[PDB]
Design a protein around this nucleic acid. Structure first.
Ligand code: MG
Ligand code: MG
Ligand code: MG
Ligand code: MG
Ligand code: MG
Ligand code: MG
Ligand code: MG
Ligand code: MG
Ligand code: MG
Ligand code: MG
Ligand code: MG
Ligand code: MG
Ligand code: MG
Ligand code: MG
Ligand code: MG
Ligand code: MG
Ligand code: MG
Ligand code: MG
Ligand code: MG
Ligand code: MG
Ligand code: MG
Ligand code: MG
Ligand code: MG
Ligand code: MG
Ligand code: ZN
Lengths: 38, 130, 94, 136, 102, 175, 135
RNA sequence: AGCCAGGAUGUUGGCUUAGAAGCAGCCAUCAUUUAAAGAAAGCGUAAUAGCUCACUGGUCGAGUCGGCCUGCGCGGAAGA
RNA sequence: CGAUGUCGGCUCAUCACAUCCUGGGGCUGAAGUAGGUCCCAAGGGUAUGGCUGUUCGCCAUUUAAAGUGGUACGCGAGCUG
């Protein structure tokens, strides 16, 4: 998990999802792209 | 494709159906690239590149085009039945070539109507000029 | 052809022009020729869409004000300093 | 790091930075980076943005810097009382009003200019926006 | 190799205080060059900031010496080469006034 | 919305019983009862169920789509049900069933003994594979997730309890 | 089924180095392919690469049908050179001619899927142009 | 948007490399069968081999897409 | 400024969390072992000595760890000096 203030799509497969009031990036292709805004 | 290119394509098919009387039908549910390339090579070695495999048989594309002439093709729109026109020669021999195409490893999806150019039935007409 | 619907400005000045620009309009003026200048108010969105075109500043424009067509050309435009907005337009009678 | 070659005076009053800017239209290039916000750009910041955008455009096309840092900014050294004269000039700033075109660029496509100006704007303290040449 | 400028500062109280405000204030600056092994402690000024600046200069100066003893040991090695040359078994032999062979 | 548009057909021998927000579907496989959010209007039209928003509910359409999907899954479950197929990977890994308890040997120092809920039944065609069947899609998915959580497939050899459909991305230890 | 074209100039029997394990990935041997290759190269001149289809069927009896020699080496023989071009557009290596190009395209017509050989002659024209050979 | 297919011919482009075959790098970055296919976007190899992608056609059958200006919110946000 | 006694030590603490250990977890250029980094988490725990008035630091040897800070840089109507 990357915990950042600026969470971005890092490739095609990253998806922005708002879970429990938190913006998150979930990537099927690349676990390194998993992001969590915080 | 924007409407203009669609209009040129529809004019092209209307011109081709006007120019050539005979044609054949084909539906590629399990139509392999091998058999498709063979049907192309067939047309090429017989004559020029005018012969195509064009898959333009929509309910509003070929069905819109046919009211010019061969209005009987309007009913054919349903269930994805394609066309292959044939300009020169009286009753060319490429009707039966699709019969062999279906015979050799195809799921039999085309169903070979033959569109009754001589106003015949759907069953194969093996009689042709020789 | 661009046709721009306009009204004659009832009141003029700094506060009145602020009020127009707040109410999604903007001032403009037609001058040129022996006719006295005409101060008009324009709908901002319509004219912004029009002037997005490059020929807005080249062709001849028709402003319809009080049911009267006037042939003009966009002489100068005042743009908002940092917004995609128009503050004022000069039309010269064509 | 831009800086006046000479200045008629060495130090300058703090002044104020009210009002809207003057260089508001894209004048030299095809695309411009305009200041929406208000503030002062240091010579270092201007240099950093120029480097970022130059590297983004791959040293292709042309870039104008429409702001020049001409106001010297003084600082007192650490651990010094409040009197004892004005502090030493440490850097130079350009006062920026909303609407000021900061950089201009052309010879590149509009998307490449947008990307270059985005990277450049990341290096600036004031909020900016992308603008294009307008006929009139 | 020119070891990078990666100085690390730690500001503490000063040794040999002399006074209440001194006993309590933290004004000495101990500087450390990372991946070098050079640690200095400057407290020869009233305030933290002057000590920190002197500490920067002193880290620079201690790396300058480290350079100097390094180059000086190379000097010594190079002269010592002049005394370890066996005037015998030749790697290569040249003859005549024109070095005619190899 | 667009999911809520499509009505859910109820095949032969599928007793639907709507009651306010509570729907009980009954089939040859089993019976499933589920209460829906108040925002959902559900009606049975002679062979089908249709869903829509109730007036005065902001997220009516999204709730309706959720309800449509849930009831369609309930239909599928009561008629033919759902099956999940796990299959263990790794030497020494195996599974067995004793009535309603899956005994797992996953390289642990203790026996792993997963109890099942009421509706789920498991079987092992082989030692490696666990095929579990049930009526409720959520429950079967949850049980499969629990078993896979016992030993999540590792990235270096794919070793662990995995879904058969799942593709385990494999990482290489770079030296 | 595993119809893959990986061979070298026919002059090398048992071309183990250039190809190696690829030709022997499955239970196929190294000897059957070479004997079939030489059996065919009896009927043609030696030294040219020859592509062949390879159906590795279960009964250990593979069906192979060959193609024409590569147009790459054929245009190399046409140019009478070995190295085609590097950094092509700046400096021109050699010059090549439409009619002999048509002579090239006419003979390989049977294998290539082209009826009007003019199209394939344009194709070989573009090939030579990229090859560094302006016609 | 999902779902079915193709995604090819020259060509395995030539070098320098240890070998380079779309994917090590340099450059050319073209032409053909053309519904369509990049001398190759990614994944894959020792090099291949091999899997998606671009695009394209098929089914379905009403909206869909991302830019702009804006109101109000969200994260950024740790202290005795 | 008609007095709010300073450093360090001792004794006794208490809180914060920006967590040193122990606990949970994500990513890893994470095979394992051992790491790196980030997230959660303050329940408990969290060296003895040599030198120096020292805090610190260096060193010796430990420890799961030898946390970082606030508390009048906590604590002299509690001690030392
Ligand atoms: Mg939660
Ligand atoms: Mg954080
Ligand atoms: Mg006023
Ligand atoms: Mg003033
Ligand atoms: Mg000014
Ligand atoms: Mg004194
Ligand atoms: Mg003090
Ligand atoms: Mg689609
Ligand atoms: Mg906020
Ligand atoms: Mg006092
Ligand atoms: Mg008193
Ligand atoms: Mg925390
Ligand atoms: Mg970790
Ligand atoms: Mg504690
Ligand atoms: Mg506590
Ligand atoms: Mg607590
Ligand atoms: Mg408790
Ligand atoms: Mg303090
Ligand atoms: Mg104290
Ligand atoms: Mg304390
Ligand atoms: Mg006290
Ligand atoms: Mg004391
Ligand atoms: Mg007291
Ligand atoms: Mg004393
Ligand atoms: Zn991603």
């Amino acid at each position: 998990m990357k915990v950042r203030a600026s969470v971005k799509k890092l490739c095609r497969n990253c998806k922005i999802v708002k879970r429990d009031g938190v913006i998150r990036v979930i990537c099927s292709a690349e676990p390194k792209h998993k992001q969590r805004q915080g | 494709a924007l409407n203009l290119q669609d209009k040129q394509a529809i004019v092209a098919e209307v011109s081709e159906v006007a120019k050539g009387a005979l044609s054949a039908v084909v539906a590629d549910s399990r139509g392999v690239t091998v058999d498709k390339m063979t049907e192309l090579r067939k047309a090429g070695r017989e004559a020029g590149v005018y012969m195509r495999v064009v898959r333009n048989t929509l309910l509003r594309r070929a069905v819109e085009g046919t009211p010019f002439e061969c209005l009987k093709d309007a009913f054919v729109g349903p269930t994805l039945i394609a066309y292959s026109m044939e300009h020169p020669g009286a009753a060319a021999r490429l009707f039966k070539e699709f019969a062999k195409a279906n015979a050799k490893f195809e799921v039999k999806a085309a169903a070979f109507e033959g569109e009754l150019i001589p106003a015949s039935q759907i069953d194969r007409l093996a009689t042709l000029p020789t | 052809m661009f046709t721009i619907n306009a009204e004659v400005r009832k009141e003029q000045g700094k506060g009145a022009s602020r009020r127009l620009r707040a109410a999604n309009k903007f001032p403009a003026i037609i001058y040129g020729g022996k006719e006295a200048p005409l101060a008009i108010e324009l709908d901002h969105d319509k004219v912004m869409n029009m002037q997005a075109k490059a020929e807005f500043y080249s062709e001849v424009l028709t402003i319809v004000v009080d049911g009267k067509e006037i042939k003009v050309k966009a002489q100068d435009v005042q743009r908002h300093p940092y917004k995609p907005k128009l503050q004022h337009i000069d039309f010269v009678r064509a | 790091m831009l800086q006046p070659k000479r200045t008629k005076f060495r130090k300058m009053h703090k002044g104020r930075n009210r009002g809207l800017a003057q260089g508001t239209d894209v004048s030299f290039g095809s695309f411009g980076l305009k200041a929406v916000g208000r503030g002062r750009l240091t010579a270092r910041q201007i240099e950093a943005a120029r480097r970022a955008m130059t590297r983004a455009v791959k040293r292709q096309g042309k870039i104008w810097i429409r702001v020049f840092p001409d106001k010297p900014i003084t600082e007192k050294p650490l651990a010094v009382r409040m009197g004892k004269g004005k502090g030493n000039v440490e850097y130079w700033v350009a006062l920026i009003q909303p609407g000021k075109v900061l950089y201009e660029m052309d010879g590149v496509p509009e998307e490449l200019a947008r990307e270059a100006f985005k990277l450049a704007a990341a290096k600036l303290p004031i909020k900016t926006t992308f603008v294009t040449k307008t006929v009139m | 190799q020119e070891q990078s400028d990666a100085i690390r500062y730690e500001t503490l109280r000063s040794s040999g205080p002399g006074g209440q405000h001194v006993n309590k204030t933290d004004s000495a600056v101990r500087a450390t060059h990372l991946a070098s092994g050079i640690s200095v402690k400057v407290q020869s000024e009233r305030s933290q900031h002057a000590n920190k600046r002197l500490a920067r200069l002193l880290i620079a100066w201690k790396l300058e010496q480290q350079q100097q003893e390094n180059s000086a040991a190379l000097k010594s090695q190079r002269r010592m080469f002049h005394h370890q040359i066996e005037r015998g078994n030749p790697r290569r032999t040249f003859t005549g006034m024109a070095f005619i062979e190899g | 919305s667009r999911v809520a548009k499509a009505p859910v057909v109820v095949p032969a021998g599928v007793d639907v019983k709507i009651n306010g927000q509570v729907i009980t579907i009954k089939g040859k496989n089993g019976e499933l009862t589920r209460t829906l959010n108040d925002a959902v209007e559900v009606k049975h039209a002679d062979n089908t169920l249709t869903f829509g928003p109730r007036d005065g509910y902001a997220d009516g359409w999204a709730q309706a789509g959720t309800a449509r999907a849930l009831l369609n899954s309930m239909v599928i479950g009561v008629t033919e049900g759902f099956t999940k197929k796990l299959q263990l990977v790794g030497v020494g890994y195996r599974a067995a069933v004793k009535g309603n308890v899956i005994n797992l040997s996953l390289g642990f120092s203790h026996p792993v003994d997963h109890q099942l809920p009421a509706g789920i039944t498991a079987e092992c065609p082989t030692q490696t594979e666990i095929v579990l069947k049930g009526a409720d899609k959520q429950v079967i998915g949850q049980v499969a997730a629990d078993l896979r959580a016992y030993r999540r497939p590792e990235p270096y050899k794919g070793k662990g309890v995995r879904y058969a459909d799942e593709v385990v991305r494999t990482k290489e230890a770079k030296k | 089924q595993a119809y893959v074209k990986l061979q070298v100039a026919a002059g090398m029997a048992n071309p183990s180095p250039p190809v190696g394990p690829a030709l022997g990935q499955q239970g196929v041997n190294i000897m059957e392919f070479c004997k079939a290759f030489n059996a065919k190269t009896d009927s043609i001149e030696k030294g040219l690469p020859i592509p062949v289809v390879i159906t590795v069927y279960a009964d250990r009896s593979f069906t192979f049908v060959t193609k024409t020699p590569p147009a790459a080496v054929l245009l190399k023989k046409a140019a009478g050179i070995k190295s085609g071009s590097g950094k092509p557009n700046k400096d021109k290596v050699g010059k090549i001619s439409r009619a002999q190009l048509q002579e090239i395209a006419q003979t390989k017509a049977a294998d290539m899927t082209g009826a009007d050989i003019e199209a394939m002659t344009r194709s070989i024209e573009g090939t030579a142009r990229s090859m560094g050979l302006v016609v």
